[PDB]
Amino acid sequence: GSHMSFSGKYQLQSQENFEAFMKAIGLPEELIQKGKDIKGVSEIVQNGKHFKFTITAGSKVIQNEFTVGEECELETMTGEKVKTVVQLEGDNKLVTTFKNIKSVTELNGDIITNTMTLGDIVFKRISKRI
């Protein structure tokens, strides 16, 4: 419609630094190897400021819900729940932090770009609407 929305299902197209990032957060090496080639489908449901994300990151599916600007508890890729807040930087960019990770999710057309930074590791994902 006239007001942009993130809602959609999106399949991973390309990624960089998956292995590095997954090892940085401590995940099992066998799981990393199994997961690195998976082209995951993620789902976003937006209603106003409220979001539900169901994301496939390698062989893990993680579901999170939050309202922009409200304290949220996010499940991380380690399974840890962390209190934080998700912010908007313009209508098409969601930004958050948790445990020194900065996560940026941007919609441009049918492409969602996620950038997750931890130390000098920049974990980049590009997904396309299905």
PDB file of C-alpha atoms in Angstrom:
ATOM      1  CA  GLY A   1       0.000   0.000   0.000  1.00  0.00           C
ATOM      2  CA  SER A   2       0.918   3.658   0.283  1.00  0.00           C
ATOM      3  CA  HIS A   3       2.794   3.289   3.598  1.00  0.00           C
ATOM      4  CA  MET A   4       5.817   1.057   3.337  1.00  0.00           C
ATOM      5  CA  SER A   5       5.922  -2.233   5.119  1.00  0.00           C
ATOM      6  CA  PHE A   6       8.574  -4.814   5.800  1.00  0.00           C
ATOM      7  CA  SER A   7       6.022  -7.635   5.651  1.00  0.00           C
ATOM      8  CA  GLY A   8       7.011 -10.528   3.488  1.00  0.00           C
ATOM      9  CA  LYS A   9       8.821 -13.789   3.007  1.00  0.00           C
ATOM     10  CA  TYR A  10      12.404 -13.437   1.796  1.00  0.00           C
ATOM     11  CA  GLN A  11      14.988 -16.041   0.737  1.00  0.00           C
ATOM     12  CA  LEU A  12      18.669 -15.662   1.329  1.00  0.00           C
ATOM     13  CA  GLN A  13      20.597 -14.906  -1.930  1.00  0.00           C
ATOM     14  CA  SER A  14      24.093 -14.229  -0.699  1.00  0.00           C
ATOM     15  CA  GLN A  15      26.049 -13.896   2.513  1.00  0.00           C
ATOM     16  CA  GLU A  16      29.514 -13.063   3.813  1.00  0.00           C
ATOM     17  CA  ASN A  17      31.362 -13.911   6.957  1.00  0.00           C
ATOM     18  CA  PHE A  18      28.805 -16.487   8.155  1.00  0.00           C
ATOM     19  CA  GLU A  19      31.513 -18.833   9.494  1.00  0.00           C
ATOM     20  CA  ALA A  20      33.441 -16.101  11.256  1.00  0.00           C
ATOM     21  CA  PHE A  21      30.398 -14.637  12.886  1.00  0.00           C
ATOM     22  CA  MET A  22      28.979 -17.996  13.964  1.00  0.00           C
ATOM     23  CA  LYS A  23      32.311 -18.958  15.526  1.00  0.00           C
ATOM     24  CA  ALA A  24      32.549 -15.583  17.270  1.00  0.00           C
ATOM     25  CA  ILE A  25      29.294 -16.225  19.032  1.00  0.00           C
ATOM     26  CA  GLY A  26      30.472 -19.752  19.977  1.00  0.00           C
ATOM     27  CA  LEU A  27      28.253 -22.069  17.964  1.00  0.00           C
ATOM     28  CA  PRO A  28      29.227 -25.720  17.296  1.00  0.00           C
ATOM     29  CA  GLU A  29      31.648 -26.140  14.328  1.00  0.00           C
ATOM     30  CA  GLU A  30      29.586 -29.029  12.918  1.00  0.00           C
ATOM     31  CA  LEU A  31      26.485 -26.817  12.971  1.00  0.00           C
ATOM     32  CA  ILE A  32      28.360 -24.027  11.243  1.00  0.00           C
ATOM     33  CA  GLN A  33      29.482 -26.371   8.487  1.00  0.00           C
ATOM     34  CA  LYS A  34      25.918 -27.741   8.031  1.00  0.00           C
ATOM     35  CA  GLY A  35      24.396 -24.317   8.083  1.00  0.00           C
ATOM     36  CA  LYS A  36      26.659 -22.209   5.921  1.00  0.00           C
ATOM     37  CA  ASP A  37      25.109 -23.287   2.583  1.00  0.00           C
ATOM     38  CA  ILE A  38      21.439 -23.145   3.665  1.00  0.00           C
ATOM     39  CA  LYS A  39      19.425 -20.484   1.722  1.00  0.00           C
ATOM     40  CA  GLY A  40      17.033 -19.713   4.503  1.00  0.00           C
ATOM     41  CA  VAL A  41      13.592 -18.226   4.154  1.00  0.00           C
ATOM     42  CA  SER A  42      12.736 -15.517   6.660  1.00  0.00           C
ATOM     43  CA  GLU A  43       9.321 -14.068   7.387  1.00  0.00           C
ATOM     44  CA  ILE A  44       8.534 -10.618   8.627  1.00  0.00           C
ATOM     45  CA  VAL A  45       5.086  -9.484   9.747  1.00  0.00           C
ATOM     46  CA  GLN A  46       4.787  -5.756  10.367  1.00  0.00           C
ATOM     47  CA  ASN A  47       1.766  -4.008  11.912  1.00  0.00           C
ATOM     48  CA  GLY A  48       2.549  -0.363  12.431  1.00  0.00           C
ATOM     49  CA  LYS A  49       5.489  -0.161  14.873  1.00  0.00           C
ATOM     50  CA  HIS A  50       5.126  -3.793  15.845  1.00  0.00           C
ATOM     51  CA  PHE A  51       7.146  -6.570  14.156  1.00  0.00           C
ATOM     52  CA  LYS A  52       7.325 -10.337  14.237  1.00  0.00           C
ATOM     53  CA  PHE A  53      10.437 -11.845  12.678  1.00  0.00           C
ATOM     54  CA  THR A  54      10.886 -15.559  11.980  1.00  0.00           C
ATOM     55  CA  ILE A  55      14.406 -15.872  10.672  1.00  0.00           C
ATOM     56  CA  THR A  56      16.398 -18.763   9.403  1.00  0.00           C
ATOM     57  CA  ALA A  57      20.181 -18.226  10.100  1.00  0.00           C
ATOM     58  CA  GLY A  58      21.893 -21.328   8.871  1.00  0.00           C
ATOM     59  CA  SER A  59      20.294 -24.273  10.637  1.00  0.00           C
ATOM     60  CA  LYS A  60      18.611 -22.186  13.389  1.00  0.00           C
ATOM     61  CA  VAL A  61      15.196 -20.615  13.263  1.00  0.00           C
ATOM     62  CA  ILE A  62      14.643 -17.798  15.608  1.00  0.00           C
ATOM     63  CA  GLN A  63      11.451 -15.947  16.247  1.00  0.00           C
ATOM     64  CA  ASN A  64      11.266 -12.483  17.813  1.00  0.00           C
ATOM     65  CA  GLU A  65       8.597  -9.839  18.350  1.00  0.00           C
ATOM     66  CA  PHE A  66       9.026  -6.240  19.334  1.00  0.00           C
ATOM     67  CA  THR A  67       7.583  -2.767  19.071  1.00  0.00           C
ATOM     68  CA  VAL A  68       9.906  -0.055  17.796  1.00  0.00           C
ATOM     69  CA  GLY A  69      11.013   2.171  20.677  1.00  0.00           C
ATOM     70  CA  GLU A  70       9.757  -0.178  23.417  1.00  0.00           C
ATOM     71  CA  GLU A  71      11.982  -2.391  25.492  1.00  0.00           C
ATOM     72  CA  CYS A  72      12.003  -5.850  24.002  1.00  0.00           C
ATOM     73  CA  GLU A  73      13.499  -9.158  24.904  1.00  0.00           C
ATOM     74  CA  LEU A  74      15.201 -10.663  21.933  1.00  0.00           C
ATOM     75  CA  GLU A  75      16.310 -14.187  21.451  1.00  0.00           C
ATOM     76  CA  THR A  76      19.875 -14.169  20.059  1.00  0.00           C
ATOM     77  CA  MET A  77      21.532 -16.787  17.862  1.00  0.00           C
ATOM     78  CA  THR A  78      23.083 -18.353  21.021  1.00  0.00           C
ATOM     79  CA  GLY A  79      19.602 -18.766  22.503  1.00  0.00           C
ATOM     80  CA  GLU A  80      20.238 -16.084  25.087  1.00  0.00           C
ATOM     81  CA  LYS A  81      17.433 -13.591  25.696  1.00  0.00           C
ATOM     82  CA  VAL A  82      18.668 -10.047  25.882  1.00  0.00           C
ATOM     83  CA  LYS A  83      16.773  -6.862  26.840  1.00  0.00           C
ATOM     84  CA  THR A  84      17.213  -4.123  24.296  1.00  0.00           C
ATOM     85  CA  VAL A  85      15.292  -1.837  21.999  1.00  0.00           C
ATOM     86  CA  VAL A  86      14.821  -1.787  18.201  1.00  0.00           C
ATOM     87  CA  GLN A  87      14.877   1.648  16.528  1.00  0.00           C
ATOM     88  CA  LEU A  88      14.021   2.967  13.112  1.00  0.00           C
ATOM     89  CA  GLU A  89      16.517   5.039  11.097  1.00  0.00           C
ATOM     90  CA  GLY A  90      14.180   6.179   8.387  1.00  0.00           C
ATOM     91  CA  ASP A  91      11.137   4.061   7.546  1.00  0.00           C
ATOM     92  CA  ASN A  92      13.079   1.251   5.888  1.00  0.00           C
ATOM     93  CA  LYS A  93      15.928   0.618   8.396  1.00  0.00           C
ATOM     94  CA  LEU A  94      15.601  -1.256  11.702  1.00  0.00           C
ATOM     95  CA  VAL A  95      18.581  -1.020  14.034  1.00  0.00           C
ATOM     96  CA  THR A  96      19.344  -2.710  17.324  1.00  0.00           C
ATOM     97  CA  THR A  97      22.023  -3.824  19.608  1.00  0.00           C
ATOM     98  CA  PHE A  98      22.615  -6.598  22.005  1.00  0.00           C
ATOM     99  CA  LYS A  99      25.801  -7.923  23.599  1.00  0.00           C
ATOM    100  CA  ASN A 100      28.019  -5.662  21.553  1.00  0.00           C
ATOM    101  CA  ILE A 101      26.420  -6.851  18.305  1.00  0.00           C
ATOM    102  CA  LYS A 102      24.947  -4.130  16.103  1.00  0.00           C
ATOM    103  CA  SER A 103      22.200  -5.397  13.756  1.00  0.00           C
ATOM    104  CA  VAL A 104      20.867  -3.328  10.824  1.00  0.00           C
ATOM    105  CA  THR A 105      17.949  -4.579   8.666  1.00  0.00           C
ATOM    106  CA  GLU A 106      17.168  -2.531   5.574  1.00  0.00           C
ATOM    107  CA  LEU A 107      14.480  -2.973   2.904  1.00  0.00           C
ATOM    108  CA  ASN A 108      15.188  -1.696  -0.585  1.00  0.00           C
ATOM    109  CA  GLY A 109      12.603  -2.898  -3.116  1.00  0.00           C
ATOM    110  CA  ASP A 110      12.287  -6.626  -2.768  1.00  0.00           C
ATOM    111  CA  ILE A 111      15.738  -6.937  -1.114  1.00  0.00           C
ATOM    112  CA  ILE A 112      16.354  -7.119   2.608  1.00  0.00           C
ATOM    113  CA  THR A 113      19.929  -6.480   3.665  1.00  0.00           C
ATOM    114  CA  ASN A 114      21.034  -7.470   7.147  1.00  0.00           C
ATOM    115  CA  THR A 115      24.342  -6.356   8.558  1.00  0.00           C
ATOM    116  CA  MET A 116      25.515  -7.734  11.927  1.00  0.00           C
ATOM    117  CA  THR A 117      28.782  -6.447  13.350  1.00  0.00           C
ATOM    118  CA  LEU A 118      30.694  -7.869  16.283  1.00  0.00           C
ATOM    119  CA  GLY A 119      34.180  -6.588  16.828  1.00  0.00           C
ATOM    120  CA  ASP A 120      35.814  -6.480  13.307  1.00  0.00           C
ATOM    121  CA  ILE A 121      33.453  -9.099  11.916  1.00  0.00           C
ATOM    122  CA  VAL A 122      30.778  -7.833   9.509  1.00  0.00           C
ATOM    123  CA  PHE A 123      28.232 -10.557   8.817  1.00  0.00           C
ATOM    124  CA  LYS A 124      26.271  -9.598   5.744  1.00  0.00           C
ATOM    125  CA  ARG A 125      23.101 -11.207   4.298  1.00  0.00           C
ATOM    126  CA  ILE A 126      21.052 -10.306   1.243  1.00  0.00           C
ATOM    127  CA  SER A 127      17.597 -11.851   0.887  1.00  0.00           C
ATOM    128  CA  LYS A 128      14.978 -11.462  -1.861  1.00  0.00           C
ATOM    129  CA  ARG A 129      11.215 -11.485  -1.590  1.00  0.00           C
ATOM    130  CA  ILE A 130       9.572 -14.757  -2.747  1.00  0.00           C
TER     131      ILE A 130
END
